[PDB]
From TrEMBL:
Provenance organism: Geobacillus stearothermophilus (Bacillus stearothermophilus)
Chain residues that bind dTTP: Q359, H385, R405, K409, Y413
InterPro entries: 3'-5'_exonuclease_dom, DNA-dir_DNA_pol_A_CS, DNA-dir_DNA_pol_A_palm_dom, DNA/RNA_pol_sf, DNA_polI_exonuclease, DNA_polymerase_1, DNA_polymerase_A, RNaseH-like_sf
EC nos: 2.7.7.7
Gene name in the database record: DPO1
Protein name (database record): DNA polymerase I
Length: 579
DNA sequence: GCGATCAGC
DNA sequence: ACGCTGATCGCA
């Protein structure tokens, strides 16, 4: 129903200097995944290419790598990483429909060409789920069905570039796509393909000690409970805690008693068993998610793990990391922090380098709110986390422990993002009247922040959306909702995403400037991970001293704000040691 | 599959 | 009744 050439070989007209390209990878995790077919649409027509002959054709391979041959794609990082696993480099991607739809509206959840095409009333293409199926019935169709689907997806990309670029221009997002998101897409592909070396023997050893330590706490729980039960079962746990031991019921779920960590901690004065349960869950958390889960996805031949950074998922412009999630590796507890010791450099005599912003969101907030006191505080390079901990616990700076500072961290972010006196009272275990007075004192010291949070909520009502400094956008229709609860959640989003999203923009530009700087200096250093406000690199030890002056300055100079940006940096033999 | 729960930023 | 996530697992 759409004409296309089911090609046997590669011809010259398939190698035009502009084309829409589809390199289809159906596997969810595209690392070392098969490429099932290729489609090319250009000024000379539409073509389908079997990959086993196109990826062996030297003319087609050189065309993929020629950055002067411009390609329009959807989810180009997926194709670039899958081609890297084939030994092939993809260059010249000038338009990515996935990232263009993500900037226009992150709430659409665009996951295939059809979903993005529907935004511009283009429907001459079927959803991937309709072609490949779901679950156990998911399979690659036969060639005449697969070929048309890929050709129709390429033809859609061919027709949709101009309408998407036009709306991006109106939204002041054209530079956000071409100079930020798309260059970052190539960087993340290099990071994902590089992987991170893992000391599997160190993990496997911890897994044996965790299993023997779990049983010790397990029997102490059975002894404290008086009987044996399924500690992971909410039904039996609720019966042991709130029926047999008759502990107070502080919170309910839709299904029964709540046993979250905040509940168990308030029950600590009532029985010893709740703290053993907390320690029991924490050991099981490390065992299930970070010992077993990490060893399951590690590449045995290289001892490397290859995460996937989802660039078009979060509503604020952050990244996310899946299978494995390398953005939530434990650190706050010392027994769980040891897992970062298993993340090691990929070569001998290389080291791990980690740099991170100091309170980037609060400094971003100070610049945007133009609050005199908050700006002055960061011009003094004050640690607002420590200062707030001093005011809360009524101590001096030398008396503030890292545990108190982490609590003040939630107070600083909580207050600026709309926490209530009720919520602050429950987080600090203080009276609700003390919380309201403390929030009152917090806003009289920073009246520009309170002014900004009121103005940004009102601007979201008038425009219907909020923006970040680099013009990333998030629509908030619920901010005019007739329901109080629904509207209140939307109001806190209006307070948060311009600040969290602007911090995501800044580090995204920092990664782009860093790689150009590294290439300029002809260094072997390269990025490994991004953890929201942290950059983790590996490099030969001979490059560490150059990086101590290069990486912080690049990150601090990504943008220029009314307050400076401060970057902390450490290096060591493991990720654990890089702090 | 969903939701409670928990690891991170 | 601060925000943004992903993985695990019992199933009330
Ligand atoms: N709304 C909210 N955002 C948070 C929270 N925690 C972290 N974020 C988000 C906000 C920011 O985007 C980032 C800050 O996380 P860190 O690096 O752990 N703390 P910082 O860098 O300020 O101080 P230092 O590094 O010296 O310890 O993660 C929170 O409790 N609430
Ligand atoms: Mn930080």
């Amino acid at each position: 129903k759409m004409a296309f050439t089911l090609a046997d070989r590669v011809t010259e007209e398939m190698l035009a200097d502009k084309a829409a390209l589809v390199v289809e990878v159906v596997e969810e995790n595209y690392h070392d995944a098969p490429i099932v077919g290729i489609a090319v649409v250009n000024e000379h027509g539409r073509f389908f290419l079997r990959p086993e002959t196109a990826l062996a054709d030297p003319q087609f391979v050189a065309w993929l790598g020629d950055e002067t041959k411009k390609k329009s794609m959807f989810d180009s990082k997926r194709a670039a990483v899958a081609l890297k696993w084939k030994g092939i480099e993809l260059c010249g991607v000038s338009f990515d429909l996935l990232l263009a739809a993500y900037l226009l509206d992150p709430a659409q959840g665009v996951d295939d060409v059809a979903a993005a095409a529907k935004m511009k009333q283009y429907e001459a293409v079927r959803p991937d789920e309709a072609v490949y199926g779901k679950g156990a019935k998911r399979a690659v169709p036969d060639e005449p069905v697969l070929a048309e689907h890929l050709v129709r997806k390429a033809a859609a990309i061919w027709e949709l570039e101009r309408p998407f670029l036009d709306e991006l221009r109106r939204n002041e997002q054209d530079r956000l796509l071409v100079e930020l998101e798309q260059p970052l897409s190539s960087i993340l592909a290099e990071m994902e393909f590089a992987g991170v070396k893992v000391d599997t023997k160190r993990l496997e050893q911890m897994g044996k000690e965790l299993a023997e330590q779990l049983g010790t706490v397990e029997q102490r729980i059975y002894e404290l409970a008086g009987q044996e039960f399924n500690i992971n079962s909410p039904k039996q746990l609720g019966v042991i805690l709130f029926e047999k031991l008759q502990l107070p019921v502080l919170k309910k779920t839709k299904t029964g008693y709540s046993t979250s960590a905040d509940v168990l901690e308030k029950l600590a004065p009532y029985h010893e068993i709740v703290e053993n349960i907390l320690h029991y869950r924490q050991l099981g958390k490390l065992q299930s998610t970070y010992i077993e889960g990490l060893l399951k996805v590690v590449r045995p031949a290289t001892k490397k793990v290859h995460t996937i950074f989802n660039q078009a998922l979060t509503q604020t412009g952050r990244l996310s990391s899946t299978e494995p999630n390398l953005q939530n590796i434990p650190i706050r507890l010392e027994e769980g922090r040891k897992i970062r010791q298993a993340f090691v450099p990929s070569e001998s005599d290389w080291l791990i380098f980690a740099a991170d912003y100091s309170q980037i969101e609060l400094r971003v907030l100070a610049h945007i709110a133009e609050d005199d006191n908050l700006m002055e505080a960061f011009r003094r390079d004050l640690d607002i986390h420590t200062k707030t901990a001093m005011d809360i616990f009524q101590v001096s700076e030398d008396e503030v422990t890292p545990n108190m500072r982490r609590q003040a961290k939630a107070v600083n972010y909580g207050i600026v993002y709309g926490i209530s006196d009720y919520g602050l009272a429950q987080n600090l275990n203080i009276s609700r009247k003390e919380a309201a007075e403390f929030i009152e004192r917090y806003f009289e010291s920073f009246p520009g922040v309170k002014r900004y949070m009121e103005n940004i909520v009102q601007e979201a009502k008038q425009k219907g959306y909020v923006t970040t400094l680099l013009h990333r956008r998030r629509y908030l229709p619920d901010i005019t909702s007739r329901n109080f609860n629904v509207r209140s959640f939307a109001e806190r989003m209006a307070m948060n995403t311009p600040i969290q999203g602007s911090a995501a923009d800044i580090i995204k530009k920092a990664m782009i400037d860093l790689n150009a700087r590294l290439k300029e200096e002809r260094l072997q250093a390269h990025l490994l991970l991004q953890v929201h406000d942290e950059l983790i690199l590996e490099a030969p030890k001979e490059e560490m001293e150059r990086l101590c002056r290069l990486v912080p300055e690049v990150m601090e100079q990504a943008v220029t704000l009314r307050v400076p940006l401060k970057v902390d940096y450490h290096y060591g033999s493991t990720w654990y040691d890089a702090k």
